Every structure is written in C-alpha cells, then in structure tokens.
C-alpha cells in the first residue's frame, strides 16, 4: 500500500500547504483546464447515449474530448451573448440575451 | 430490363454509376450503392416536388416559380435544417411582420 | 453534345404524382443544381466514411450511415425504406 | 437526474471564465437545455459512426470525426 501512503502524504501536503466580483473574471480567463465535474458529466452523456442506442461502451478520452468541446461551445455562446447583453444596456444577462444568439447562428 | 428501370424507379442508375466511376470516389463499388443513391435522391426529389405542388396550390397557380420553391423549402422544418445555408436566385424571403412596429396589432 | 440533367425524370415523377401541375425551366435548373449538390454531399461523406472504416469500397452500408448522418431522422428512415425497396426490387435480376 | 449534475456554481465559474459581472437565475436551465441539445446533436453522429463500424466502443476517432463533420473541429485526438 505504498501508493496509498504516497496519496495520504500528498493529501496531507495539500491540507497543510494548499489548504466586488471583479476578480473572478480575470482569474478564470487565464485558466486552461476543464471546469465541469467529470463523473456527473459522464453519467449525463451515458443517459444521452441511452436514447440513441444496446450496451454501448465508452473510451475515457472520448468523454474528455466531449467535455472539452461542450465547454468550448458553452463559453463561445456565453462570450457571444455578453456582447448582446451589454448592447441592450444590461450588465446582468438574461434568457432573452441567450435567444438571439441561439437564433441567428443556427 | 436495364439497370435504370429494373427496380421500377425514376432516376437513372447508369448516370450516377458513370459519375462515381470517373469521379474517383473509391477503388471498387458495390452493386447496391448506385440504386441506393437512386432511391435517396428520388425520394428527396419526390418530397420537394410534393411540397412544390402544395406551394403552387397555395398560390392557386400551376407552374413553379422560385417563390414556390421557397415555400416548399423554408416552410418545412427538416428542409430548413437541410437547405438553410443555400441561396436561391429570385426566390423571395418569407412574409412575416413583427408586431411592435404595427401600432394596432 | 449534351449536358447531363434530370428534367425528364423530374417531369416524369411529377406527372406521376400529380399530372395536373407544371414547372418552369428556372426552377428546373435550381432543382438540377440541388440534386447535383446533394449527390456531391452524399458521395463525399460516403468517401470519408469509407476511408474512416479501413475499407476502400462503397457498399450500401456506408450510404445508409451517410444518409443517417446528413439527412434528418424522419427522412433518414424514409430513405432507408426507399433504399431497401430499391435493392429488393433490383435484386430480382430475371 | 443527471441533467442537473452541472450545478449552479459550475455555470457560475463558466460565466466567470466568459466574463460576466452579474448573472440571473433564469440562465441555468436554458444553459442545461442547450447543452443537452448540443450533446444530442453531436452524439447522434458519433454513435452512427460507431454503429456502422461493427463496434460498441465510442472511440475518440469517432467523436473527432463527428466534430469535424459538424464544423467545430478539435485538435489532438486524431485527424
């Protein structure tokens, strides 16, 4: 159980060392990794594939590429709706703002 | 009977087989693929022709104008999601008026 | 000299569906461009799908998957119905 | 339910990645609905690819080919 001892040592190291909303915009714009929790998204795409299926398997890198592409499409639609939101003199976005960009793209 | 009419269809099979034979799409070709192309394109043609006849009946005419083609394609949902990004010469956009510009209704 | 078109077949299937309707030549050229465009779409997608399936031939399976790809699902199941009808009425080679 | 697995602070962090100051409470359900719609629209092609191939593994090659077919192509997982 040397891997378990190394994991407990790394967890202890993270617990000891590693452990006005304007900061989060510039904070999460320089982040590179994913931002959606992994295994609920895997359960969700398993439920989506149950509509169009048979015990269809799943490689892990395929679900990783799906999570990356879905996060990219969502931040693309959100970055495009922010401009239409501020264009209508709304700092706070609304569901009407994510209707025209969902309409005029297709 | 020839291969263009052995299946009791309308579109020619030798035409699309000659187009794929010199179009360099594969090494070989299965026998069911040109008649399958025949069936798919004749069903698409028959569906858009039925919608074109319905569009010509909607405007009480007999012949087909590009307005009848626009009423055939852009009114149906699947033809909109299939032929949305294609422009049509002298077609005509759909008649739709927003309500806030009308001061009554 | 000639240019390959399908105006005769379009007029034949149109008079077969409803003989009391006509069609001009501009809409005929539009529909000829349309059928050449969707033939190009299905043929290039089938070539892509055959190159992706490690198989350098074109059977009806790749065409079935390709019309399940780009056509909508109601038109996809109607297309596989028409395709199975075409193969079953063509296989009687007597 | 698995559609609500992407919770409220997840979409909040996504919006902070996309640069929003204040967000409303009507955003999250439409975000989840358009996410389910995009996932269905890519997964139908990605499983017809693996159903043609006499396979049951939805391979990364199949999802990058389905992404290249629908415009939004990814890099690194084939192609």
């Amino acid at each position: 159980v040397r891997q378990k001892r190394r994991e407990k040592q790394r967890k202890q190291s993270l617990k000891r060392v590693e452990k006005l909303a304007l900061y989060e915009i510039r904070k999460y714009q320089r982040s590179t990794d994913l931002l959606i929790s992994k295994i609920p998204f895997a359960r969700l795409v398993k439920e989506v594939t149950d509509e169009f299926t048979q015990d269809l398997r799943w490689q892990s890198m395929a679900i990783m590429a799906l999570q990356e592409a879905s996060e990219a499409y969502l931040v693309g639609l959100l970055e495009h709706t922010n401009l239409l939101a501020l264009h209508a003199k709304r700092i706070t976005i609304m569901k009407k703002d994510m209707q025209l960009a969902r309409r005029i793209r297709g | 009977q020839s291969r263009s009419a052995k299946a009791g269809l309308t579109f020619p099979v030798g035409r699309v087989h000659r187009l794929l034979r010199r179009g360099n799409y594969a090494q070989r070709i299965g026998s069911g693929a040109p008649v399958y192309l025949t069936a798919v394109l004749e069903y698409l043609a028959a569906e858009i022709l039925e919608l074109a006849g319905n569009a010509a009946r909607d405007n009480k005419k007999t012949r087909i104008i590009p307005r009848h083609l626009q009423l055939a394609i852009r009114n149906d949902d699947e033809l909109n999601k299939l032929l949305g990004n294609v422009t049509i010469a002298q077609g005509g956009v759909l008649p739709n008026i927003h309500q806030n510009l009308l001061p009554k209704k | 000299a000639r240019k390959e078109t399908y105006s005769s077949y379009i007029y034949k299937v149109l008079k077969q569906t409803h003989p009391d309707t006509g069609i001009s030549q501009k809409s005929m050229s539009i529909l000829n461009s349309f059928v050449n465009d969707i033939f190009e779409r299905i043929a290039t997608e089938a070539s892509k799908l055959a190159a992706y399936n490690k198989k350098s031939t074109i059977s009806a399976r790749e065409i079935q998957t390709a019309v399940r790809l780009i056509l909508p699902g109601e038109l996809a199941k109607h297309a596989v119905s028409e395709g199975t009808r075409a193969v079953t009425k063509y296989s009687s080679s007597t | 339910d698995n559609i609500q697995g992407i919770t409220k602070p997840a979409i909040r962090r996504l919006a902070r990645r996309g640069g929003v100051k204040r967000i409303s409470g009507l955003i999250y359900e439409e975000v989840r609905a358009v996410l389910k719609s995009f996932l269905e629209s890519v997964i139908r092609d990605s499983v017809t690819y693996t159903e043609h191939a006499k396979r049951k593994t939805v391979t990364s090659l199949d999802v990058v080919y389905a992404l290249k077919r629908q415009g939004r192509t990814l890099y690194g997982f084939g192609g």
Binding site: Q99 | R74, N75, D77, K81 | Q16, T17, G73, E74 | A33
Partner: peptide, 22 residues
C-alpha cells in the same frame, strides 16, 4: 408513382425550447 406525406407542423421554432423526437 405516389408519395405519402409526413409530419409538417412547424418551422422548428427553437432557441427557447427543445426540438421534437422521432
């Protein structure tokens, strides 16, 4: 010869709801 009709009930009004399932 004769072609049967299908479901033509909508222009697929989307972007605030979901689509139909076959």
């Amino acid at each position: 010869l004769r072609k049967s009709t299908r479901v033509k009930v909508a222009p697929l009004q989307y972007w605030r709801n979901e689509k139909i399932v076959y």
